[PDB]
Design an enzyme around this catalytic site. Structure first.
Site, short mmCIF file in Angstrom:
data_model
loop_
_atom_site.label_atom_id
_atom_site.label_comp_id
_atom_site.label_asym_id
_atom_site.label_seq_id
_atom_site.Cartn_x
_atom_site.Cartn_y
_atom_site.Cartn_z
N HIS A 255 0.85 -1.22 -0.13
CA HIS A 255 0.13 -0.17 -0.05
C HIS A 255 0.81 1.43 0.26
CE1 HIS A 255 -2.92 3.10 1.87
NE2 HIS A 255 -3.59 2.36 0.89
N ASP B 85 -6.13 1.74 -2.25
CA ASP B 85 -6.80 1.57 -1.01
C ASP B 85 -7.72 0.23 -1.01
OD1 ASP B 85 -5.72 3.70 -0.13
OD2 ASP B 85 -7.63 4.80 -0.03
#
Length: 124
Positions: free
Chosen positions: A47, A89
């Site tokens: 991420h 996300d």
């Protein structure tokens, strides 16, 4: 935006990102260094890398649009850069959900910097 990321985590993983993923291992939380310690930690590592490759918009404050269809989170909007933030996300939320089986806060919460040496920092 980060508030949306928290929302996706609660929607997909059914857990609070702030409570379970804000200071876990070497990468779950702001920044990171060293080796991703486990599955969950690597989710965060990826991420961080994903956000690092976004150019043209701001992953922290820009707001993206999404909808829920066919039992999934569908990133949309007319802005390709914002859609890219949403994908980052979305992927992380799913990764957290898929690795709940090995989540271990007792061993990895507040892991410590010494355990995450800068010399062992895996490159994206």
């Amino acid at each position: 935006s980060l508030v949306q990321f928290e929302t996706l985590i609660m929607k997909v993983a059914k857990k609070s990102g702030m409570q379970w993923y804000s200071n876990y291992g070497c990468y779950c939380g702001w920044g990171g260094q060293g080796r991703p310690q486990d599955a969950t930690d690597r989710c965060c590592f990826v991420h961080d890398c994903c956000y690092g490759k976004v150019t043209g918009c701001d992953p922290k404050m820009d707001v993206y649009s999404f909808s829920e269809e066919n039992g999934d989170i569908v990133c949309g909007g007319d802005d390709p850069c914002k859609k890219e933030i949403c994908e980052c996300d979305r992927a992380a939320a799913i990764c957290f959900r898929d690795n709940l089986n090995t989540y271990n806060d007792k061993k990895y919460w507040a892991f410590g910097a010494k355990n995450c040496p800068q010399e062992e920092s895996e490159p994206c």
